[PDB]
Structure formats: structure tokens, C-alpha cells
Design a protein around this ligand. Structure first.
Ligand code: 6WR
Ligand code: 6WR
Lengths: 9, 228, 236, 10
């Protein structure tokens, strides 16, 4: 999920 | 844990500093305006995500909880933003500094004019209440933390109580009496139910557009599929 | 104007006395549940509750001061919210279950009988658990229900100021109830916020419930009363 | 009219 990766950054 | 240690002035300052920028957009048509709005929403989402991480107490949560809260609240957060920017523009929605739409331009998209009306009415209410910027950033943080809390949980409510304390602090600082503080707090929070209502209608409207083409970004599609 | 003159205790007493009765469903235990038969019971119950809700609404201080146009519009906007908060309230002492009627107590597994209704049941159950966690009082409940009636449609409109004054009055009543309960000044505005934030979730459940009900209508699952059809059309 | 409209008139 794109949201998942943007938060993890 | 540090969020609980913040004073009322630290909360306001932290939220004010975490504020996302006001982005710009690109004879309009239906697919044209929808293209502009969804393109704008997509870029705003990227700023919102990094804004949430700067909201005190949010990073304490697991990635799963962070994802869930943003999935539930993203359109609400975009809408209260729009309504806030449109405060000093009666009868107009300020999607972008170069994109100032009246209610009639909302008729360019089918069914959107009803949502436009609800947004304008909300903006008028904020103007009638003379909503302050410090109050606004508190309300926006509340939306992020509250909208998906019922769908660890005590920490969320701890932070939520802190923001309530922060709102009351701003009102007491504004010279309001004790009765006025409580009343104004109630007025502001009841608006969030209307904002919830507008988001639900918008999610239904945006899902109607997807099924029937005009394009949407992959991120936007994922945020949309989360409500279905 | 009479509403604005009432004391907090007069507000409480008025709202308490105005409370609608608890109705029974037309549940028939001789036949097994189907999707249609379950939706039939729930909408039949809702229809009969609506009639009593209308009587209740007229006894909510300040509501009768509004035009017929405004009364209709507030009820059209808030009816499902009001049905749900009442349901959630009377389900408090039944953990994991929803007390639609004294002879109709359902758990979430029975909600699976109807397509897409279990998601709504889960939200209703969670709200019920939230009220139970906060130890919601009856006096607070009737204040919240009256707030929903006056607020949910207040923005999709001088008469607006009247509603807001009555709403501020109920705010005063809530605070007074909490102070009377012995809560500290800080605890008072904190709890006031907690209770009002729940209304945003009740709004959410209502919108989802409206979509689901509309879906059941457009698939001819259950015949809706002309009243329910009108209340539904108001949201579409 | 609406049924609601009449029910309130009771
Ligand atoms: O900052 C923004 C950007 C875009 C939008 C949109 C405005 C309305 C459209 C869609 C949701 C419902 C409509 O399709 C997104 C909003 Cl509310 C705020
Ligand atoms: O006091 C009541 C009666 C009925 C219902 C209903 C329960 C579920 C159906 C419908 C809303 C959505 C479903 O179709 C009405 C509720 Cl929440 C409360």
C-alpha cells in the first residue's frame, strides 16, 4: 500500500 | 509519551509549525474540473501524511493504526482545510489561490453542487463563529485522531483530552467566561459531525466518478477503496 | 423562548419526561430468519418508532418554536441517528448484543443474515461499548439525543440563532449534570468533548445505514413504508 | 404532502 510506504519514510 | 508532556502553548506551536502549505492547481468542463480537483487532492495527500507524523502522539502509534486513522479521516481533513481557506471568501470555495470556485461552477460536475453547498455553509459557520487559526489546527488534529478510533486506544483518548485542554486554553486566553468556553467548545465539535457527513457524501460522490471513467492517482484510489 | 427560560434541572426533567416508549418487534420465532425477514422486522420496528419519535421531538424544548418546514427537515436529517443512539443506549447493559426490542436481542453473528449489515452492527456494538466504558448517564443520553435532533440538519438550511441558543442551553445542562456528578472543572470539558465526538461516529453510522437501507430498497429485499420511503428519499 | 409533514401536525 502506498500510504504504508509514505508513513514508513 | 512526549505529547502528554506538552503544555497548552507547546501544543499550539507544534501544530502551527506542522501546518501543510497551500498548494496551487493547473473554459472548464466536467472532466477538466474533476481532473484539477483530484490532482490537487493527490498532491495535498502527500503533505497531509507528513503533517500527521508531526501531530503530537501520532508517531507513538503502530503503522497499522496510523494507516487506519489516515484512511478514515483523509477527506475530512481535506474538507476542513478547504473550508478554512474559504473563510474570507463568502459564497466561494478556495481550492487553490488560482482556483476560486463559486457554487455555480460546482454544477459543472454532476451531483457535486450539493456537496459544494454543504462546504459553503460550513465556511459561513466558521466565519460567523470567527474561528481562529489556533482553534482550526486543534480541530484538524482532533479529526485525525477521532474519526477512526472506534473502528493503545487509551493513548489516543489521552492525546484527545490534551487537545480539548488546548482548545479551552485558547478560549480562556481569549477572555471568554467559563460558560462561554464550554458553549464554544460544543459549537466547534458539533461542526465535526457535519464535516463527517460531508466526507461520507464526498466519498460516495468520488466513488461514483471512479466507476465511471476520469482518472485518479494510485494513492487516491487506495484511500478510496479503504471506505469500500 | 420557553426553552431559553428553563433551568438546567427543568431542561433535564422535560427531556426525561418526553422520552419515547420501548416498543416490541413483530418477531415470529416459528419461522427461521432470512435476509428479507430480518430486514422486515427491523424496518417495521423503525417505522413504528418514528411515529413516537415525532411526538418526542415536539416535546424537545424550542423545537415547536420552529416552522413546519424546519421541523420536517431536522427530523428527515436526524431520524436514523436518533434511532441508533437510542438502540446503542438500551444495548449498554447487554455486552456484545443489540437490544432492538425486548423480544429482539441480536449478536453480530445474527447480523450476518443480512448482506452488509454486520459492519453496521459492529459499529453500533462498539459505540455501545464506548458508552458503557464512559458510564453514560440517562440524563446525558437525552441531552445528546436532543443535540442530534437540533444539530444534524442545522447547516443544510434568525431562526438559526434560536436553534443555536437552545443548543448552547443543552451544553449548559450537560456541564451542570457533570458538575453535579462531582467531576472536576477539567474533567467536565473533557467529558463534554468525549461525548460530542461520539456524535461524529453516530453521524457516520447513520450515513452508512442510509446507504445500506437504500441498497435493500433498490434490490426489493423488503417493502418499506411510505413514511420510510420519504425519510430515505430526503437523503437521496 | 409528505407524511412527516402531517404527523407533526398532531
Ligand atoms: O483540498 C481539496 C481538494 C479537493 C477536494 C475535493 C473536492 C470535492 C471532490 C472530491 C471529494 C468530493 C468531490 O468529488 C475532492 C477537496 Cl474537498 C479538498
Ligand atoms: O431502533 C432501530 C431500529 C432499526 C434500526 C435499523 C437497523 C439496521 C437497518 C436500518 C439501518 C440500516 C439497516 O438497513 C434500521 C436501528 Cl439502527 C435502530
Amino acid at each position: 500500500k502506498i500510504l504504508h510506504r509514505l508513513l514508513q519514510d | 509519551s512526549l505529547a502528554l508532556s506538552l503544555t497548552a502553548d507547546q501544543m499550539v506551536s507544534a501544530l502551527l509549525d506542522a501546518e501543510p502549505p497551500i498548494l496551487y492547481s493547473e473554459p472548464f468542463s466536467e472532466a477538466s474540473m474533476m481532473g484539477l480537483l483530484t490532482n490537487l487532492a493527490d498532491r495535498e495527500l502527500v503533505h497531509m501524511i507528513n503533517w500527521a507524523k508531526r501531530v503530537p502522539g501520532f508517531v507513538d502509534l503502530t503503522l497499522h493504526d496510523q494507516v487506519h486513522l489516515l484512511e478514515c479521516a483523509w477527506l475530512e481533513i481535506l474538507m476542513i482545510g478547504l473550508v478554512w481557506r474559504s473563510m474570507e471568501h463568502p459564497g466561494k470555495l478556495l481550492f487553490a489561490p488560482n482556483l476560486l470556485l463559486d457554487r455555480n461552477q460546482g454544477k459543472c460536475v454532476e451531483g457535486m453542487v450539493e456537496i459544494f453547498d454543504m462546504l459553503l455553509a460550513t465556511s459561513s459557520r466558521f466565519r460567523m463563529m470567527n474561528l481562529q487559526g489556533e482553534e482550526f489546527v486543534c480541530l484538524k488534529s482532533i479529526i485525525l485522531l477521532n474519526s477512526g478510533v472506534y473502528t493503545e486506544k487509551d493513548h489516543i483518548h489521552r492525546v484527545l483530552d490534551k487537545i480539548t485542554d488546548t482548545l479551552i486554553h485558547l478560549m480562556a486566553k481569549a477572555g471568554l467566561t467559563l460558560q462561554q468556553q464550554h458553549q464554544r467548545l460544543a459549537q466547534l465539535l458539533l461542526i465535526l459531525s457535519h464535516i463527517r457527513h460531508m466526507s461520507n457524501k464526498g466519498m460516495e460522490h468520488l466513488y461514483s466518478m471512479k466507476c465511471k471513467n476520469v482518472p485518479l492517482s494510485d494513492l487516491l484510489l487506495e484511500m478510496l477503496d479503504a471506505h469500500r
